[PDB]
Amino acid sequence: LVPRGSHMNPKRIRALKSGKQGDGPVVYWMSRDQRAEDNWALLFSRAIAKEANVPVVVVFCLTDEFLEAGIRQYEFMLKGLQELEVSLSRKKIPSFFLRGDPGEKISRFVKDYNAGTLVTDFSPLRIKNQWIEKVISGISIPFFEVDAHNVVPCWEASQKHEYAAHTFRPKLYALLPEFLEEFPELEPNSVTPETLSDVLETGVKALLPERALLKNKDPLFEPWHFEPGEKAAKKVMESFIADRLDSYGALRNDPTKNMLSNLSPYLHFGQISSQRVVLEVEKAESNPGSKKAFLDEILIWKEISDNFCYYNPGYDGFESFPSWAKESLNAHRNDVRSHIYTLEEFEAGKTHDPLWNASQMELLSTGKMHGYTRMYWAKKILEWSESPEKALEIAICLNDRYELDGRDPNGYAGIAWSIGGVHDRAWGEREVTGKIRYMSYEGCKRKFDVKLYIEKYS
Ligand SMILES: Cc1cc2nc3c(=O)[nH]c(=O)nc-3n(C[C@H](O)[C@H](O)[C@H](O)COP(=O)(O)OP(=O)(O)OC[C@H]3O[C@@H](n4cnc5c(N)ncnc54)[C@H](O)[C@@H]3O)c2cc1C
């Protein structure tokens, strides 16, 4: 229960576990949505706290899986969290950063701090479901989840996997009048109920030996492309609206032009609300076509990615591909590939294709490959791998290791679109790739200045 007129639509919250309510603070276990503003999970947690006459507190687990990615993501996330600490402190909301995996750490915290209710944000990924299962086994209090990432809650937008954007789109757009709304301000707590710097230091030291380096032993990553945190995210949104949105419709598929929003790293960590971005873009007057194209990406393609992962347990495997694509890829399994590269050769941009290599270098150096070349990149991994299963493994590995926005439903769904035709149709049949949409080098040369892209990233 929340207080009458709290402005919380109950369709945004799902019970994970019934239990017996305790009398202490409401705990928001923050995971996907690393921000204080425009956060329905935090807002719901505050509202339940107010109804129960207790404070809200935030807990975040610094998990054991950080070593599976790089310094680039760890520093981006933790610097955001340092700013978040302050934001939450200004609302008199304490934040606790627990070192370890959620099952042990969240269970113990709930007991030690006498928590009344536990609330988390929503992610459809396997690792969050693993964590939920272990937490559920370790607690006796009620446990809810709130979809703070999507404009329309994932379980409301559709009751099933949607095979195409054109089947999901009408369902989603029909629910915007209900779910696309302004956020209430977060009410502070009535009274105030190892530092992150130390953790960051220790974590970086553990990651240092696996840092991406050029032949010179100088690091590849350039950390000045995306300043982390809530405040920076808002400035990137504003600069997008002011300077890039007008040309987005025309230039979104030109990797030589900096005309995308550049919001993905911030959206991935939830340092900015996609609902906020949509409210601001909807209000803007910009060139015809650009708003339509942008909203299709941040509403339809982003939210269909959650739909995909939520409703397909095997979202990172061949089995989740559509029947037509599985049958087609199987028919061409024994076709001889034109090249076969090792993971190391792919990783280091050592293929015979200079466009592919440049795309990989953009990823290595900036942590954000242009959206258009991501499609090209993943499709060539299918073409130059022993099997579609190996291609998935390779693409996922590199995406997750090097993209700031990686380890994300958008990645799994984008890779599945690219390699497996998920959310696509059948195209002309070719050897090796069957009926999976093909993106040729020469097609790219016709579409944009390939030589310039290659010069930029070599
Ligand atoms: C092989 C492959 C891998 C990808 N890996 C990821 C990933 O790991 N993480 C990730 O966030 N996106 C991924 N994408 C989707 C997309 O390429 C990025 O979201 C986009 O390039 C991010 O840049 P931007 O924010 O400047 O994009 P903009 O064009 O400004 O779009 C704004 C936002 O809309 C959403 N969006 C845009 N395009 C897509 C799309 N095709 N699918 C789903 N959502 C979209 C994203 O949240 C993005 O931040 C992948 C796509 C492919 C083809």
Domains and CATH numbers, the chain: 1-148 (3.40.50.620), 149-317 (1.25.40.80), 318-458 (1.10.579.10)
From the CA of 252, give the closest atom in ligand 1: 29
In the reported structure, the alpha carbon of residue 271 is separated from the centroid of ligand 1 by a whole-number distance in angstroms of: 16
From the CA of 298, give the closest atom in ligand 1: 34
Which residue bears the tokens 């299963």? 389
Is 375 a pocket residue for ligand 1 (Cβ < 6 Å)?
yes
Burial 306-343 (b: 16+ CB within 10 A, else e): bbbbbbbeebbbbebbbeebbebbeebeeeebeeebee
Q: How far is CA 202 from the centre of its chain?
A: 25
In the reported structure, the alpha carbon of residue 338 is separated from the centroid of ligand 1 by a whole-number distance in angstroms of: 29
Torsion 422-425-426-431 (CA) sign: negative
Which residue bears the tokens 């016709």? 446
CA 37, CA 230: separation in Å to the nearest integer? 9
Residue among 330, 333, 329, 324 at smallest CA distance from 424: 324
Residue among 408, 159, 176 at smallest CA distance from 307: 159
Which residue bears the tokens 């301000």? 185
CA 32, CA 110: separation in Å to the nearest integer? 20
Residue among 174, 130, 182, 125 at smallest CA distance from 152: 174
* Of 73, 246, 264, best ligand 1 pocket probe by most atoms within 8 Å of the beta carbon: 264
Residue among 361, 365, 385 at smallest CA distance from 373: 361
Q: Count Cα neighbours of 35 within 13 Å in the Cβ-side half-sphere.
A: 24
CA 412, CA 315: separation in Å to the nearest integer? 7
Pairing of strands 13-17, 95-99: unpaired
Angle between helices 371-383 and 409-420 in degrees, nearest 10: 50
From the CA of 407, give the closest atom in ligand 1: 8
Is 405 a pocket residue for ligand 1 (Cβ < 6 Å)?
yes
Burial 90-105 (b: 16+ CB within 10 A, else e): ebebbbebbeebbbeb
Residues contacting 114, CB < 8 A, separation 6+: 22, 23, 24, 25
In the reported structure, the alpha carbon of residue 273 is separated from the centroid of ligand 1 by a whole-number distance in angstroms of: 15
Which residue bears the tokens 């941040």? 298
Angle between helices 274-283 and 230-239 in degrees, nearest 10: 30
* Of 238, 410, 423, best ligand 1 pocket probe by most atoms within 8 Å of the beta carbon: 410
Distances in Å between the Cα of 193 and the Cα atoms of 82, 188, 228, 296, 325 are 20, 11, 29, 43, 56
Number of residues that make up the chain: 458
Angle at 406 between CA 265 and CA 419, to 5 degrees: 130
Residue among 249, 308, 241, 306 at smallest CA distance from 278: 241
Residue among 78, 35, 364 at smallest CA distance from 202: 78
Pick the residue whose CA is nearest to atom 26 on ligand 1.
Answer: 262
Pick the residue whose CA is nearest to atom 48 on ligand 1.
Answer: 264
From the CA of 377, give the closest atom in ligand 1: 1
User: What phi, psi does 235 have (nearest 5°)?
Assistant: -70, -35
CA 135, CA 14: separation in Å to the nearest integer? 16
Is 433 a pocket residue for ligand 1 (Cβ < 6 Å)?
no
Answer for the pair 91, 240: CB distance below 8 angstroms, yes or no: no
How buried is residue 440: exposed, middle or buried, by Cβ count under 10 Å (0-12/13-18/19+)? exposed
Distances in Å between the Cα of 141 and the Cα atoms of 15, 43, 405 are 11, 19, 33
Is 267 a pocket residue for ligand 1 (Cβ < 6 Å)?
yes
Which residue bears the tokens 């920076």? 232
In the reported structure, the alpha carbon of residue 337 is separated from the centroid of ligand 1 by a whole-number distance in angstroms of: 29
- The reported resolution of this PDB entry, expressed in Å, is 1.5
From the CA of 378, give the closest atom in ligand 1: 1
SS (H, E, C) the chain: CCCCCCCCCHHHEEEEECCCCCCCCEEEECCCCCCCCCCHHHHHHHHHHHHHCCCEEEEEEECHHHHHCCHHHHHHHHHHHHHHHHHHHHCCCCEEEEECCHHHHHHHHHHHCCCCEEEEECCCCHHHHHHHHHHHHHCCCCEEEECCCCCCCHHHHCCCCCCCHHHHHHHHHHHHHHHCCCCCCCCCCCCCCCCHHHHHHHHHHHHHHHCCECCCCCECCCCCCCCCCHHHHHHHHHHHHHHHHHHHHHHCCCCCCCCCCCCHHHHHCCCCCHHHHHHHHHHCCCCCCHHHHHHHHHHHHHHHHHHHHHHCCCCCCHHHCCHHHHHHHHHCCCCCCCCCCCHHHHHCCCCCCHHHHHHHHHHHHHCCCCHHHHHHHHHHHHHCCCCHHHHHHHHHHHHHHHCCCCCCHHHHHHHHHHHHCCCCCCCCCECCCECCCCCCHHHHHHHCCHHHHHHHCC
Q: Which segments are annotated as binding site for FAD?
A: 248, 261-264, 297, 368, 374, 399, 405, 410
Is 260 a pocket residue for ligand 1 (Cβ < 6 Å)?
yes
Q: Count Cα neighbours of 287 within 13 Å in the Cβ-side half-sphere.
A: 14
Answer for the pair 42, 186: CB distance below 8 angstroms, yes or no: yes
Sheet of 117-121: strand order equals 13-17, 143-146, 117-121, 26-29, 56-62, 95-99
